[PDB]
């Protein structure tokens, strides 16, 4: 009925009569689409006709027919053909649908066209019909002051025109909203945009607006330099810092980037900045001279060892050979880290009597964490055990060379020349086992000193050690060369180290080379897929062990859906328990970004029958959940503690201490059960050696630095993430082979202190904010919004996470400026106008300065 006969009249003559016929159809296009469905071939056949001028009204009819037919994409073509009868300003569900479909089709096409050309939005490469609605709707949202739809689609659509045009027009320069708008772009572009080049342009475009520093935020400019690692933009800020004359304006950039950039980019801020000019006051700051001196004085003032709980752990039994005396020494050195005090080595005579030549190495290595951070007297501590002073034996002499590595790591350029001379002397031949110990300890020391820095002398010196095929020092060669190849690395060293793995079949060399090939692939992402294929195809157990962490390091930081798919396939098809354990641990390093989905994945794998998978997912859960929230992951590790298997409980106790750090005293109700298990596992005679070692080290991690330091992993506050923390966490999976890799965890332990730090040199004042604070201030090991101000302010542990709720009063005369930051681990921030006769209180700290 109605227009039904008018549909078949389109084949008659008198096209002028058809004009009045199509007008009556325009009313029923939204009513009955059934009769039109049979006439659709006739309606479209008249569109291409040159003598048919009604295509404007003809396209309007088919717009609401194919739409009601169930094809949304087809209705977009008819709506964009006429470009007349379609009303973009009409308010209806039909018009709003085509807009959503046309923009969605524009994103799918412009996604793959951004790689070929970035000018596509200025050219005809994309159909102008899709850009007609797309360009007008984004400009319509700009007039409505809506940045969600304008900036949200531009990031997904991969268009640089909207980002630049909108940000310039919305400038309020307040110096407030313009900073948040940029922050919304950097936060979403990392998770949404997969392309690293598109997000790289956003960092460069937003850099030109704030390059003059119109009272902007230093947090935004610091994320651009670290992420891009560009030498031009790194020194571009200092060029503006020279124009404006201020003592502390360059401090916030200097003190933040010294702990921000990796060893590669720090060389640009020191060596490359020297040629272009710098500030003599910032010479030591950018080189990290006071940075080491800061962390030494943080843990020295307040240190609570609580030997009452420590003595009961190591006095339980004198047996278990050196395994018992080593685990209690490693957990003890964590509490003395940076304070340069030895309770176990000095104050306790008898516990060193049963140590043999093999135990003296790990006992000496405990002092490396204790004295870590000493740039001057670190040699005087090991001086009797250093070469030239001989030693009680040549086995313990090698421990002094390894102790210098943990202390001087990354700053050891001075110690680098001393350690490589011993390697050359021992590279020719070795007739004794203790000779390799001196070569093993010196290689691990130079590897940490040159870690992150590419050095051709270290690669060539350790390469000759690999040719000797040593069963002791052969592992340190690949580990030392791998730390120098961090980052992009040398593509030639990838195939060279991989060839030596297939030639020499070893027990530690082949597994060590797999770790070295993983470190060089860190940050390469898809660039390492060539070597990953060779490891997955090989049937060697040691090559498959390092293939999982190769994916973990390359895909670290920003995650990948294909990286998780590859790791889950290895932990299933492969029957090797060590590879299944290594694959599930690699899952955490890829999932670091999103910690909410981590406990759900590892819990499904913890229900299987394999003990190594349950043990691997035990510590893999405590990695990303350590310095983050979501305390419900403890319930996932609860059934793993009751597992009678010895090594499953070891990795479970360590992961509990990482998540529960600073969670005591009315924060997590489960902290009461973990504090009892500290001495419950050791004193229990039914427990095994591996079970007692997991509970003993876990107690030392929570009490490390006098129960102060915490594990900071993936701090976005900076350019992205903390690199030195990931290095130690990958190592914890490898434990019982030769030496425990928990020693390298000290790189992830940093103190949280709020202290003045005058912009000139150093301050260490005494001041009290008298505002909100956590309850861990007075919390010490024994034998929301609180509305109540607290007098505990300067230094003194507590929680860096909840510091965002702290308020400020006058207190010190220097006063706050920018409302600070809220990150406790920065420990420096900025002081305003030093040299004020406020009668400042200072410490000594003259030994290392």
């Amino acid at each position: 009925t109605t227009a039904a006969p008018l549909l078949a009249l389109l084949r008659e003559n008198q096209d002028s009569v058809k004009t009045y016929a199509l007008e009556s159809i325009n009313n029923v296009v939204d009513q009955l689409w059934s009769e039109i469905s049979n006439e659709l071939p006739d309606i479209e056949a008249l569109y291409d006709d040159d003598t048919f001028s009604d295509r404007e009204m003809a396209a309007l009819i088919a717009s609401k027919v194919y739409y009601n037919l169930g094809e949304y994409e087809s209705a977009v073509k008819y709506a964009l053909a006429a470009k007349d009868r379609f009303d973009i300003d009409e308010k209806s569900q039909f018009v709003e649908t085509i807009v959503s479909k046309s923009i969605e089709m524009y994103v799918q096409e412009a996604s793959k066209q951004y790689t070929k050309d970035e000018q596509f939005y200025t050219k005809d490469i994309i159909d102008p019909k899709l850009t007609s609605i797309f360009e007008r709707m984004i400009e319509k949202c700009l007039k409505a002051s809506e940045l969600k739809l304008a900036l949200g689609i531009a990031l997904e659509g991969y268009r640089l025109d909207i980002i630049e045009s909108a940000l310039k027009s919305k400038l309020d320069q307040s110096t407030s909203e313009n900073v948040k708008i940029i922050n919304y772009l950097l936060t979403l572009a990392i998770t949404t945009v997969t392309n690293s080049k598109f997000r790289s342009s956003i960092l460069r475009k937003s850099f030109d607006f704030l390059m003059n520093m119109p009272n902007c935020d230093y947090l935004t400019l610091n994320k651009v330099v670290v992420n891009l690692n560009d030498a031009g933009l790194a020194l571009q800020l200092f060029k503006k810092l020279k124009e404006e004359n201020d003592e502390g304006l360059s401090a916030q950039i200097a003190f933040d980037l010294v702990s921000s950039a990796s060893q590669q980019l720090l060389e640009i801020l020191v060596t490359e900045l020297t040629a272009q000019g710098y500030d003599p006051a910032l010479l030591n700051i950018l080189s990290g001279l006071p940075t080491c001196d800061y962390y030494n004085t943080f843990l020295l003032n307040n240190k609570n060892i609580d030997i009452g709980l420590l003595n009961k752990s190591k006095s339980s039994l004198d047996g278990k050979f050196s395994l018992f005396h080593t685990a209690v020494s490693v957990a003890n050195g964590f509490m003395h880290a940076g304070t340069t005090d030895n309770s176990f080595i000095k104050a306790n005579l008898p516990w060193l009597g049963k140590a043999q030549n093999w135990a003296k190495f790990t006992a000496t290595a405990s002092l490396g964490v204790i004295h870590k951070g000493n740039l001057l007297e670190g040699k005087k501590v090991m001086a009797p055990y250093l070469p030239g002073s001989r030693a009680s034996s040549r086995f313990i002499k090698g421990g002094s060379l390894y102790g210098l590595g943990l202390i001087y790591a990354g700053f050891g350029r001075d110690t680098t020349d001393y350690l490589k001379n011993i390697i050359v002397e021992n590279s020719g031949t070795s007739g004794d086992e203790d000779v390799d110990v001196l070569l093993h300890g010196a290689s691990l020391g130079i590897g940490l000193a040159a870690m992150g820095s590419a050095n051709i002398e270290v690669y060539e010196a350790l390469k000759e050690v690999l040719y000797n095929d040593s069963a002791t020092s052969g592992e340190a060669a690949a580990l030392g060369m791998g730390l120098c190849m961090l980052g992009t690395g040398k593509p030639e060293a990838i195939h060279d180290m991989f060839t030596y793995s297939q030639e020499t079949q070893h027990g530690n060399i082949t597994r060590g080379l797999a770790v070295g090939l993983a470190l060089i692939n860190y940050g390469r992402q898809e660039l390492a897929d060539d070597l990953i294929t060779k490891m997955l195809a090989s049937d060697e157990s040691l090559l498959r062990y390092g293939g999982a962490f190769t994916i973990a390091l390359a895909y670290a930081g920003t995650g990948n859906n294909s990286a998780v798919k590859r790791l889950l396939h290895v932990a299933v098809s492969d029957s090797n328990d060590d590879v299944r354990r290594a694959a599930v641990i690699a899952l955490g390093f890829v999932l670091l970004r999103d910690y909410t989905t981590v406990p759900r994945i590892v819990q499904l794998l913890s229900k299987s029958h394999n003990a190594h998978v349950r043990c691997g997912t035990a510590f893999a859960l405590g990695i990303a959940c350590a310095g983050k929230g979501l305390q419900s992951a403890i319930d996932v590790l609860d059934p793993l503690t009751k597992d009678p298997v010895d090594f499953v409980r070891q990795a479970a106790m360590i992961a509990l201490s990482m998540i529960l750090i600073q969670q005591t005293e009315k924060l997590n109700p489960q902290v009461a059960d973990i504090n009892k298990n500290f001495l419950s596992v050791i004193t229990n005679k039914h427990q095994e050696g591996l079970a007692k070692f997991g509970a003993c080290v876990a107690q030392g991690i929570m009490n490390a630095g006098g129960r102060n330091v915490t594990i900071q992993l993936e701090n976005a506050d900076t350019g992205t993430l903390d690199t030195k923390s990931v290095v130690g966490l990958v190592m914890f999976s490898q434990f019982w082979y030769w030496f425990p890799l928990a020693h390298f965890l000290s790189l992830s332990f940093t103190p949280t202190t709020v202290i003045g730090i005058r912009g000139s040199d150093q301050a260490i004042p005494k001041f009290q904010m008298n505002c909100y604070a956590k309850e861990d201030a007075f919390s010490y090991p024994r034998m929301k919004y609180s509305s109540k101000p607290y007098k505990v302010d300067n230094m003194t542990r507590i929680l860096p996470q909840q510091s965002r709720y702290i308020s400020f009063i006058k207190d010190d005369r220097f006063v706050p400026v920018r409302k600070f930051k809220g990150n406790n681990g920065v420990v420096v921030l900025r002081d305003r106008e030093p040299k004020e006769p406020v009668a400042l209180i200072e410490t000594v700290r003259q030994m290392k300065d």
């Binding site: 649908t97 969605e104 229900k607 299987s608 029958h609």
Partner: protein
Amino acid sequence: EQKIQETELKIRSKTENVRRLEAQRNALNDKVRFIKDELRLLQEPGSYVGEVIKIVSDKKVLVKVQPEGKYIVDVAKDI
């Protein structure tokens, strides 16, 4: 949020589909683990049968085995 709200149903749809398939895998994981745990019990040599005769303060009990002779054995630490 037209596309966000429309695709929200796919979140609850795929979530309820995968969780209900995990219970079948978790059941198979419990069956294989149970059979594996019961395998080492059958491989165990087992135990004899006997009757308690007399006990002393030395934690040594005299158990009379029917096929074999009488043997004085030490009691377990759990009892």
